[PDB]
Design a binder for these strands. Structure first.
Ligand SMILES: [Mn+2]
Ligand SMILES: [Mn+2]
Lengths: 177, 177
DNA sequence: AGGATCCT
DNA sequence: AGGATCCT
């Protein structure tokens, strides 16, 4: 649906969106803070050409998940909604007379490092990491580390801390595969 | 994405499409036969208003699944593709200056009665039927009846024959729930 | 209930 | 590998 973007064009779009995201809640437009917007996906991995732009939005309250992506607003930018729910929302945005795919995802604060790790990818890397943890009866996803469907609380805050606690070598996003 | 259709408008669209569906295969446009096109979903259940139109296409060869929906063609009608693969293809068609959702699905000959049953719905009915079979260690889907992930070949040809063999009362599509 | 396509 | 949204 969306056209190809260069990495620089993608970064320009992310920079534009950082101050312009909001959601409608009880008849009020609530602005989303730049600090709670994280560029993820292939843009974070510095791929030269992008099929879409991926943003992770950190939502401060569980009760707001109902309202954020389903009532997403982008100041001054026209867009259509391809698919949308509380956790994923795919938009086709109009930018400089062309149409591009913007993927929006949400995470709660407690999920943040797991979500950054997940949404950064790439898929081949996630599969190898998850297969290794699966052998030790763990399940890793964008929400947490689980054993036997029960959350395994880890004493970590950042993505780096998570990767170290999971027992893997840290790699900059561009070198993950 | 698509507008609401009346049942009669839906039927008009199905009638139009019956002679106009084809797919591109090795540089040739292969016409799909009307006899292999079955109206399913809420249109088959005679719902007064439709959110979309559902067609089941019966594909004569397994090897053609690669080619049919991914290269679907509709003579004289403009459309865009929302999502598409070998088994489901959702199109937004232009009809009399309005946009409507056309859902296309494929089944092989051996799957036909199971596919008709599945795609006719409604969801509430499928769930109750499938839950009852699940208690007897069976799994029913659009492809067949399974026990322990193994196909259970049934001596049936039609949807009516299938429903009787599965041990349920036959109901016209409009009365299934 | 069960599966398809699409997201990383 | 694992999950979201959408299809019946
Ligand atoms: Mn991406
Ligand atoms: Mn339908």
């Amino acid at each position: 649906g969306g056209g190809m973007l260069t990495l620089i064009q993608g970064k320009k779009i992310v920079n534009h969106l950082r101050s312009r995201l909001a959601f409608e809640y009880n008849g009020q437009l609530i602005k989303i803070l730049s600090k709670n917007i994280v560029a993820v996906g292939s843009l974070r991995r510095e791929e030269k050409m992008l099929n879409d732009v991926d943003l992770l939005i950190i939502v401060p309250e569980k009760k707001l998940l109902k309202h954020v992506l389903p009532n997403i607003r982008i100041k001054g930018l026209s867009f259509s909604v391809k698919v949308c729910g509380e956790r994923k929302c795919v938009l086709f945005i109009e930018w400089e007379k062309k149409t591009y795919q913007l993927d929006l995802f949400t995470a709660l604060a407690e999920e943040k490092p797991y979500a950054i790790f997940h949404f950064t990818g790439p898929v081949s890397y996630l599969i190898r990491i998850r297969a290794a943890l699966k052998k030790k009866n763990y399940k890793l996803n964008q929400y947490g580390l689980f054993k036997n469907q029960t959350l395994v609380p880890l004493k970590i805050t950042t993505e780096k801390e998570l990767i170290k606690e999971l027992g893997f070598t840290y790699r900059i996003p561009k070198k993950r595969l």
